[PDB]
Assembly symmetry: D3
Homo-oligomer: 144 residues x 6
C-alpha cells in the first residue's frame, strides 16, 4: 500500500501539505467542484490512491455515479455546468503543464465563470492535488 512512509519521515512536509487543505477548507470555492478537480487530476496523473480517496470523498459530497463515471470523458457529455467545464479545462491544462504552453485566452475564459478570488482558490486546489499525486505515485502508494 506504500513503499515509503513519508509523513513519518518528514512530519514538517506532512504539516505543510495539510496547510494547503486547511486553506481550501476555508475557501468559498464549493466542495463538490474541488472534488471533481481532485479526482480528474488524480486520474490524469495515474495516482490510484488519490483516485480512490476522491471518488469516495466525491460521493460524501453528494456526487452521482453518472458524473463519477463520465468525469474522465467530461468534454463530450452534458453533465457538467459551464462553470465546472471552465474549471476542468483549467484542471486538464495545468495537470499537463510539462507538455506545452497554456492557450492565450484560457484565463480570460475562466474569468467569465469565476471571480478572481475563486480563480486563486481553484488554482490552489489544482496545485494541491498535483502535489498530493506526486507524493502518492512517488512513494509507491496503492489503494485498499
Amino acid at each position: 500500500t506504500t513503499r515509503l512512509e513519508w509523513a513519518k519521515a518528514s512530519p514538517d512536509a506532512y504539516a505543510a501539505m495539510l496547510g494547503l487543505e486547511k486553506a481550501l477548507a476555508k475557501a468559498g470555492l464549493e466542495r463538490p467542484l474541488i472534488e471533481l478537480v481532485y479526482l480528474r487530476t488524480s486520474q490524469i496523473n495515474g495516482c490510484a490512491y488519490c483516485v480512490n480517496m476522491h471518488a469516495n470523498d466525491a460521493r460524501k459530497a453528494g456526487e452521482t455515479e453518472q458524473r463519477l463515471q463520465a468525469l474522465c470523458v467530461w468534454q463530450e457529455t452534458p453533465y457538467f455546468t459551464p462553470r465546472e467545464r471552465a474549471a476542468l479545462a483549467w484542471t486538464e491544462q495545468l495537470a499537463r503543464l510539462s507538455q506545452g504552453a497554456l492557450p492565450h485566452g484560457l484565463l480570460d475564459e475562466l474569468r467569465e465563470h469565476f471571480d478572481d478570488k475563486e480563480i486563486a482558490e481553484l488554482t490552489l486546489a489544482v496545485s494541491a492535488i498535483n502535489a498530493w499525486n506526486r507524493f502518492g505515485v512517488g512513494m509507491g502508494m496503492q489503494p485498499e
Copy 2:
C-alpha cells in the same frame, strides 16, 4: 508581468504556499540541490517567472554558469553528482507525471543516494515548485 494578482485575491492560498517554503527551509536537504530541482522543474513546465527567480537564487546559493547552462541537458554532462542525477531523474519523472507510469525501480535507485527523510523533503521540493509553476503560468506571470 501578471494577469491576476492571486496573493491579494486569496491571502490564505499565499500563506499556505509559503508554508511549503517554511518546511523546506527547515529541511536537512541542501539548498543548492533544491534550487536545481526548482530551476529544472520550472524549465520543463515553461514557467518563465520561476526560471528567472531560481536561476538568480541558484547563483545566490553559489552556482556556476557552467552548471546553470547545462541543467536543461544534465543527462549527457559530467557536471552533476550521482546524488544530484538521482534527484533530477526524480524531478523530471514527477514533472511529467501526466505522461505515464513511473519506472518500477526509480524509488529504489533514489534510496541508494538519499535516506527516507531526504526523499520526503526532495518530494516536497518537487511538489512545491510544481505548485508555484501552476500559479505562475496560470496567472500569466512574466519575469523582469
Copy 3:
C-alpha cells in the same frame, strides 16, 4: 446526442457491427472481462457514449464501484487479476496502436494467462470496441 444517425444511413454497416457482437456473445471469454476491455478502451478513446453504456453494462455483469472507479488507473491497484491485467495491458497497447510498436514479449505474456482461442476472442473484443468508439466519436455521440 448524435450529429449523424449512421445506423439509419447504412443499415448494412449496422448489421455488420452487430455481427461482431454476435460472435462475442458466443465466445467462451467471460462477459465481465469483455466489459472491462470495452470500458477501458472507451475511456482511452474518449467515447463518452460508450463509457456510459459499458459502465452501466459492467454493473449489469456484477461489477463493483471500487473496480469501475479504479479501472482508469488499474496498473497501480490490487483489484484486477493476473489474467485481467494481461488483458488490460493488451487493451491499452492496442488502443494506442498509432503511437508505436507493440513490445516484443507482449503476446508471449498474454499466452501465460489465455489459450489461443481466448486470445483471438479477446482481440475481437478489443477490435470491436475500437470500431464502436470510432462511430461514437465520429458521429458526435453524447450520453444521456
Copy 4:
C-alpha cells in the same frame, strides 16, 4: 509470418470480420478510396501485413506509384482530391483516436464532400481496417 493462427483458433471471429468486408463490398463508396483509407491506416498503425496487402490491392484497383508513395505525406501534395483529402483527414484523426479530441468542425467538413450514407460507409471502412490492424500487429503478422 504469424505468431498465432487466429482465424483457426476462433472461426467465429474470422466470420465476423469478413462480415465487415461483405458490407463494404456492397457499399456505394468507391473502392480506390477504401484502399487509400486501408493503406493509410495500416501505415499509421504500423501493420506491415496490411500495408503490403493494401498497397498490392490498391494497384489492383488502378492506383499509380506516384499516389502510393505520396500517401504517407498526402497533406502536402496535389495528388488527392478534395473528397479524398476529407476522407484522409477523417482517417488520420480516427486512427489516432487515443491521442485526443476530434476537432469540432471535422464532421461538418466531411459533409461538404460526402452524403450521410457515404459517411457511414467511410466510417465502417476506417473501423474495419483499424480492427484488421489490431489482429495483424497483435498476432505478430509479417508480410511476404
Copy 5:
C-alpha cells in the same frame, strides 16, 4: 510547388548544401542504403518534395516496389538486412532527436554492422536529409 525560391535568394546556402551531397557521393557508403535513409527521413519529417524525389531516386538505384512500400513499416518486415535495420534504427532515432534521449547501446549496436568511417558517412547522410527536409517543408515545397 514552392513559396520561397531559397536557392536564388541565398546561392551560398545552396552551394553549402550541395557540398554535403558532394561528400556523400565520394563516401564508400552504398547508394541504395543512402536512398533508404533519405526516403525514410523524409517520410518521418513529412517532406513531400523529398519523399517524391528519393522514392524516384531509389528506383534509379535499383529498388523494388516491395521495399519502397514497406519502408515506412520496415521494423515488422523481413525485407531489410541486419545492416540496413541498424541504419534505419539510427535514422529513426536521429530524425526524432527532439523527442528524447538516444538509447545507451545504440551506437554500440551500429558498430556491429558498420566501421567507424561508415558510421560517420551514415550520420552525414542522416544530417543532410534532415537539412534538406527543413528547407523543403519550411519553404512550402510540394512535389509534381
Copy 6:
C-alpha cells in the same frame, strides 16, 4: 567526451559540415541571432556538447545571463524582439519537424520580419545546427 572521433574517420564529412559554417559566416544574418538559434536547437535536441559551445559563443557575441537563462522559456518573456521571436518560432517548429505539420501561416509571419535572403540564411542556420546536433548526440559527445 566522445565515443567516436568522426572528423578523423571521415574528413570529407567534416569539411562538408564546415562549409555550412563558411556560408553562414558570409551571411548578412546577425551573429547573435544565429547563436540563439544554435543554442535553442541544441537544448531541444538534448545536445550537451553544442549547448555548452553555443552558450559560450553567445557570450562571445555579447549575450547577457538574463537572455541565456530565459531562452528555453522565451515565449513567456519580454526579452526577445519581434524578429527574434519569429526566428525562434521557426527554430522550434523545424527542430520538431518529425512531430507534425508546420502551421499554414508560419512562413508568412516570418516574412513580416525577414526578407527572403534572410529567411534562406535563417533556415541554413536551423539546418546546420540540426546537423551538428545529430553528430554530437550520435557520436556520444559530452561537454568539458
